[PDB]
């Protein structure tokens, strides 16, 4: 599909069971072992599989291939042999913890340790504008997360930084098998990063969101066709979205 101008996606589930099925073949063929009885060429096994993912240019067709490998650590130690081979080959990691899974954060993505080194050059113009401040807003919250357990004698800026960090977190939680659209995603983030939620109670942020999304699908369908097709969010759509979340927030609690 990459050779013929099309696009593709591949998922290896999982690559940490290929290095084990290859170690057994080595030690039965009497090859010299190494660290944790892996052979000397387990780096050459995973490198020439992930380097086949490429973004071709227009003279060859314009195809692509995207690769998502899954790697299982043991007790959260990424400094093992195979969790350090595949980390240094690829671009960025998504680090799912087990502590956040039981504290209510589902999907339990830790955004403190997750990176991507293509950066913001793969986001659309609508998503890039709102999430650039959200990434800065959440990163200021994780500095002051250790003051939440006993904090009431702090500055009003610090009480504000805690107040936005909890409510931005509730927007990030998501049920299973419910994938959204980018035009619906940018609207929910726009409702939170502007300041339209600092008076709503932190337990109601989930109920407010499922109510607000079913509204704008049926009653504002002509605005979510001018962010899908436009790609960016203009000044005309900035005012048009502004009275929408003010109309819904006014009469909401019923």
């Amino acid at each position: 599909f990459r050779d013929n101008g099309k696009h593709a996606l591949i998922i290896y589930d999982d690559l940490s069971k290929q290095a084990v099925a290859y170690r057994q073949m080595s030690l039965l063929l009497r090859r010299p072992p190494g660290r944790e009885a892996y052979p000397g060429d387990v780096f050459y096994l995973h490198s020439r599989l992930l380097e086949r993912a490429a973004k071709m240019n227009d003279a060859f067709g314009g195809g692509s291939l995207t690769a998502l490998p899954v790697i299982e650590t043991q007790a959260g130690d990424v400094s093992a042999y195979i969790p350090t081979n595949v980390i240094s080959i690829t671009d960025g990691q998504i680090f799912l913890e087990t502590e956040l899974f039981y504290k209510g954060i589902r999907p339990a993505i830790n955004v403190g340790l997750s990176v991507s080194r293509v950066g913001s050059a793969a986001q659309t113009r609508a998503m890039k504008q709102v999430a650039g401040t959200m990434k800065l807003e959440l990163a200021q919250y994780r500095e002051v997360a250790a003051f939440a357990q006993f904090g009431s004698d702090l500055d009003a800026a610090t009480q504000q930084l805690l107040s936005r960090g909890v409510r931005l977190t509730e927007l990030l939680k998501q049920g299973q098998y419910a994938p959204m659209a980018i035009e619906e995603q940018v609207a929910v983030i726009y409702a939170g990063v502007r300041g339209y939620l600092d008076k709503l109670e932190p337990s109601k942020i989930t109920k407010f969101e499922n109510a607000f999304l079913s509204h704008v699908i049926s009653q504002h369908q002509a605005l979510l066709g001018k962010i899908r097709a436009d790609g960016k969010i203009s000044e005309e759509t900035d005012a048009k979205l502004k009275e929408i979340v003010t109309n819904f927030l006014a009469g909401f609690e019923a």
Binding site: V20, A21, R23, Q24, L27, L28, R30, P33, E36, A37, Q74, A75, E99, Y102, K103, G104, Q149, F150
Partner: protein, 351 residues
Amino acid sequence: SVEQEILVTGIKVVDLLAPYAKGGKIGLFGGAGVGKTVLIMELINNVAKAHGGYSVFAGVGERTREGNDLYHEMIESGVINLKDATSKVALVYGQMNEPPGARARVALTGLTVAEYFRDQEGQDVLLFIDNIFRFTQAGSEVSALLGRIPSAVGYQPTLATDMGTMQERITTTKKGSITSVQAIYVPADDLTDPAPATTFAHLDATTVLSRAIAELGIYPAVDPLDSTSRIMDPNIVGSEHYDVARGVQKILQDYKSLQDIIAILGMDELSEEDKLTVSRARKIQRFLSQPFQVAEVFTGHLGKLVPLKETIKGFQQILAGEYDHLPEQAFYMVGPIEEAVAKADKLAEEH
């Protein structure tokens, strides 16, 4: 086969947070001396006499004494009958006095008798296996004389292939169904050892036992924040059971992060709002412990069996706050929530 169900047992920790399933592979983890043989003796007590079809017990590499306390606790309960043709249990035994070439072909002999009932007949079969770590270990002893370089910490190079060659016959096909409970020894309390940490791919419901709970007196010591299931699903267990299970794990995990403050500050210097989420969590820890039936000679207490509809309704009321007027001791080793207040008054009068 692809269909999923729920098989009710009667244990409060198991049915609430990690439900078992008909025709599904179940695992019992934990170290040495925490209760893997007793908890697998409990499911022959509850499940095997109310079951229609037959049952097979394969004992692989355990003490030869404990194969006699099964032959003498199954004659006096009438499951094995020595006088006619109405018995319901077969037994296959290769214990820890055998040569190590014979502790690695007994588990293949257990699931050969249990394959006859599923295939040549059509009945619903159970299968209990204890222990199954002694299938891996008994192949790591004959290995170096067969001419093989060792892998990581000392196991054979063909570790995850002959394990996966036995564990693909214990399945539910379109000709029958095999429920299977297995006890899995974890060596010196380390679930990152290569023998227990590759059985996880073959199990639907894992029940991780723990020595840090058992040394509190909470019995059965099942870790709630480490046990999973594939049917903890609000489309299968309903939306009322689902928001109760996650409501218990959220208040237990938030209780863990509060213990780091009490070590420096103290209990009394906390606020009144989180002096309540501790006291709600401590009543949830103690309410999970249930007096077993086959552990009467340890305890002297009686055997309780709480149904499924009562386990949810017991835990809604501790979370909502309908029992904030009782001390913690009123829930220790009780059955349903009705006996939690009858035990509360009987402690009061002796002041």
